[PDB]
Amino acid sequence: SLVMSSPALPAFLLCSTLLVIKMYVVAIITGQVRLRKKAFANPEDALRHGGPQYCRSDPDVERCLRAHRNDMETIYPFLFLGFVYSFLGPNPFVAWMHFLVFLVGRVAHTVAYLGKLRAPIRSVTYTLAQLPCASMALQILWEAARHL
Amino acid sequence: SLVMSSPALPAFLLCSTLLVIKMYVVAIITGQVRLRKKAFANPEDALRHGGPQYCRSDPDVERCLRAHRNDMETIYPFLFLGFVYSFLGPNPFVAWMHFLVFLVGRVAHTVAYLGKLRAPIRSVTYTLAQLPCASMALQILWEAARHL
Amino acid sequence: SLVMSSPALPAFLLCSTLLVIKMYVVAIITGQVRLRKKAFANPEDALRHGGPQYCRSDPDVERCLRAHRNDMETIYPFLFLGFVYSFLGPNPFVAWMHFLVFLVGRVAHTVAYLGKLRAPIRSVTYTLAQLPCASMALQILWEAARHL
Numbered sequence: 416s417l418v419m420s421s422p423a424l425p426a427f428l429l430c431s432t433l434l435v436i437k438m439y440v441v442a443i444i445t446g447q448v449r450l451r452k453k454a455f456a457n458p459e460d461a462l463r464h465g466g467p468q469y470c471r472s473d474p475d476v477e478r479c480l481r482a483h484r485n486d487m488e489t490i491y492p493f494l495f496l497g498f499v500y501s502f503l504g505p506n507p508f509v510a511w512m513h514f515l516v517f518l519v520g521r522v523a524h525t526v527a528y529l530g531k532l533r534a535p536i537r538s539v540t541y542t543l544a545q546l547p548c549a550s551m552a553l554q555i556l557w558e559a560a561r562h563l
Numbered sequence: 564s565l566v567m568s569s570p571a572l573p574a575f576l577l578c579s580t581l582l583v584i585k586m587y588v589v590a591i592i593t594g595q596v597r598l599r600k601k602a603f604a605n606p607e608d609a610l611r612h613g614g615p616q617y618c619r620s621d622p623d624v625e626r627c628l629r630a631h632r633n634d635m636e637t638i639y640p641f642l643f644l645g646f647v648y649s650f651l652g653p654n655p656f657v658a659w660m661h662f663l664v665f666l667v668g669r670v671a672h673t674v675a676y677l678g679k680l681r682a683p684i685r686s687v688t689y690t691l692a693q694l695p696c697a698s699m700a701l702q703i704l705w706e707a708a709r710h711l
Numbered sequence: 712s713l714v715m716s717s718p719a720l721p722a723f724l725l726c727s728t729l730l731v732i733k734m735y736v737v738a739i740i741t742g743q744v745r746l747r748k749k750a751f752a753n754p755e756d757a758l759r760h761g762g763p764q765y766c767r768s769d770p771d772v773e774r775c776l777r778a779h780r781n782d783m784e785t786i787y788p789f790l791f792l793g794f795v796y797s798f799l800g801p802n803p804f805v806a807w808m809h810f811l812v813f814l815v816g817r818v819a820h821t822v823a824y825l826g827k828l829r830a831p832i833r834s835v836t837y838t839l840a841q842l843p844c845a846s847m848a849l850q851i852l853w854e855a856a857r858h859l
């Protein structure tokens with residue numbers, strides 16, 4: 416199998432795919448909150464679900480969208496950086512630690528965001544998860560630059 | 564050519580690139596709507612196009628942005644999942660079906676969103692397109708986990 | 712090293728990673744602006760930083776978010792297109808020009824956006840950067856289609 420193209424690749428693919436699924440979970444929750452709070456973004460949606468007054472914003476829906484947006488600001492870059500990093504021959508354990516810190520940090524971020532946990536819990540989880548991303552980015556820079 | 568690295572790869576690259584172009588089409592439409600409705604996000608844009616009163620929101624511009632945002636929530640994960648999936652040796656026809664369902668579902672989603680089609684047309688197209696994504700995600704999980 | 716899988720790959724990886732770092736810079740600036748202007752998205756953040764009145768929108772924060780959103784609309788597609796394009800055996804110099812135009816255009820875009828530069832400076836930088844993306848997309852289409 417091509418999953419074994421590099422020793423770190425299976426771990427990367429596991430963590431990344433779990434994170435994509437975690438984003439889908441946020442999308443599912445968003446839809447459920449819209450229905451429960453009757454807060455739809457579009458007049459055509461609202462008319463199907465009780466009337467035009469239900470085309471409206473809701474703080475919980477907005478919170479869900481912020482969590483999803485933050486995921487797009489952070490998880491998408493990881494999908495790129497982690498994939499490339501997997502092929503740079505990093506120490507297997509060190510690579511695992513990079514991926515695990517990101518996975519744990521981001522799952523915790525979503526829990527802290529949607530669960531409305533006190534500050535600075537969410538901020539800390541964001542910062543923690545960005546650390547391995549910064550690390551991988553710099554490593555890719557050096558490897559790319561030296562092969563120019 | 565490296566497009567033939569796997570039997571499913573050409574089909575994946577065709578569908579994905581068409582979807583990226585489809586997102587660019589949404590960006591183009593957004594710009595056109597801003598100009599036609601004179602609804603700009605920035606004061607510097609507004610002053611160039613008639614005066615400060617044109618720094619304002621517009622429902623059609625907001626709708627365009629929602630379509631583009633939903634694309635980012637769905638097409639970007641597909642770019643990752645579909646690429647990885649292409650190298651897992653899936654049945655060529657089965658892989659084609661995954662990619663085609665996503666392509667058709669997402670093009671239909673944009674038509675339903677921007678065309679303001681009645682509910683639940685847009686919701687159905689979203690759900691249909693997410694099915695092959697869920698399928699690919701699970702397959703990657705099993706392959707990654709078993710190579711740990 | 713696997714960075715030399717294709718002659719254009721090192722240049723692509725350099726430009727892409729710099730652009731990811733440039734997006735992280737926007738995220739950092741956004742956080743700094745929120746703190747300076749005391750404009751937080753969440754009640755729990757506001758209570759930590761002076762009181763509930765600081766859960767509020769701010770034009771500079773909104774501008775930062777627009778720059779970041781536009782990055783997600785443009786840089787993320789480049790990460791995909793440029794990676795694939797690197798393996799299609801393009802002329803090394805021509806490939807470098809594609810990547811450099813995108814890098815320069817996007818850095819200029821962020822400067823023009825956050826610096827509130829007069830129209831049409833930002834619009835021009837956006838359009839300039841999209842040109843190599845359109846070019847790569849079409850090239851991938853032809854290569855993918857011909858291998859079906």
Ligand SMILES: O=C(Nc1nc(-c2ccccc2)cs1)c1ccccc1Cl
Nearest residue numbers: 446449450455460463682683686687690
């Ligand atoms: O009405 C909604 N979804 C639906 N989805 C379906 C559906 C989707 C796939 C298969 C069958 C039915 C039938 S109504 C909806 C939910 C949240 C927000 C807005 C809307 Cl417009």
Ligand SMILES: O=C(Nc1nc(-c2ccccc2)cs1)c1ccccc1Cl
Nearest residue numbers: 594597598603608611830831834835838
């Ligand atoms: O004025 C706008 N675009 C322009 N683009 C150009 C341009 C771009 C590339 C090459 C030449 C001219 C010249 S004015 C604009 C459109 C939608 C929203 C906001 C603005 Cl600020």
Ligand SMILES: O=C(Nc1nc(-c2ccccc2)cs1)c1ccccc1Cl
Nearest residue numbers: 534535538539542742745746751756759
């Ligand atoms: O208060 C904030 N960040 C913090 N971050 C920390 C922190 C993060 C990582 C390690 C140590 C402390 C401690 S307070 C904050 C900033 C902008 C917006 C909202 C918030 Cl809630």
Ligand SMILES: CCCCCCCCO[C@@H]1O[C@H](CO)[C@@H](O)[C@H](O)[C@H]1O
Nearest residue numbers: 437440441522525526527529530531
């Ligand atoms: C990967 C998806 C993570 C979902 C985590 C959701 C956390 C929900 O947690 C809930 O949050 C509520 C406030 O929103 C609180 O009132 C509840 O006490 C708490 O159980």
Ligand SMILES: CCCCCCCCO[C@@H]1O[C@H](CO)[C@@H](O)[C@H](O)[C@H]1O
Nearest residue numbers: 585588589670673674675677678679
């Ligand atoms: C890939 C890009 C897809 C663009 C599809 C745009 C669909 C436009 O469709 C139009 O929608 C209008 C409402 O917005 C209706 O008034 C018109 O009858 C309809 O033609």
Ligand SMILES: CCCCCCCCO[C@@H]1O[C@H](CO)[C@@H](O)[C@H](O)[C@H]1O
Nearest residue numbers: 733736737818821822823825826827
């Ligand atoms: C990659 C990150 C790029 C950051 C570029 C920030 C540009 C800041 O530039 C500043 O913009 C201010 C208005 O916002 C002006 O008042 C100042 O004159 C100008 O120096």
Ligand SMILES: N[C@@H](CCC(=O)N[C@@H](CS)C(=O)NCC(=O)O)C(=O)O
Nearest residue numbers: 481482485537538541738741742752
């Ligand atoms: N787009 C972010 C940029 C900075 C960021 O990601 N901050 C973290 C830690 S405070 C966060 O969780 N932001 C909340 C959010 O993006 O909604 C923002 O607006 O805050």
Ligand SMILES: N[C@@H](CCC(=O)N[C@@H](CS)C(=O)NCC(=O)O)C(=O)O
Nearest residue numbers: 442445446456629630633685686689
């Ligand atoms: N971010 C989405 C999450 C759920 C979702 O993607 N729903 C589909 C089917 S109702 C959709 O088209 N949402 C409209 C949108 O994202 O603007 C939302 O706010 O609705």
Ligand SMILES: N[C@@H](CCC(=O)N[C@@H](CS)C(=O)NCC(=O)O)C(=O)O
Nearest residue numbers: 590593594604777778781833834837
């Ligand atoms: N989502 C974009 C689509 C078009 C676009 O990307 N336009 C460029 C040139 S005017 C831009 O910088 N848009 C500002 C933005 O996205 O906030 C928009 O709303 O304008």
Ligand SMILES: CCCCCCO[C@@H]1O[C@H](CO)[C@@H](O)[C@H](O)[C@H]1O
Nearest residue numbers: 545546547548549550551553554557
């Ligand atoms: C907030 C910034 C986090 C810093 C990440 C550190 O990242 C480290 O950078 C070093 C120098 O580039 C590298 O030698 C090392 O491999 C890398 O892990």
Ligand SMILES: CCCCCCO[C@@H]1O[C@H](CO)[C@@H](O)[C@H](O)[C@H]1O
Nearest residue numbers: 693694695696697698699701702705
């Ligand atoms: C809404 C959830 C959609 C379900 C997608 C089904 O996806 C299927 O999952 C099976 C078990 O993991 C796999 O054996 C199979 O290859 C895959 O197509």
Ligand SMILES: CCCCCCO[C@@H]1O[C@H](CO)[C@@H](O)[C@H](O)[C@H]1O
Nearest residue numbers: 841842843844845846847849850853
């Ligand atoms: C706004 C549209 C920009 C046009 C990009 C041009 O892109 C060009 O397209 C040609 C035909 O597909 C290709 O032969 C060529 O390799 C490519 O650079």
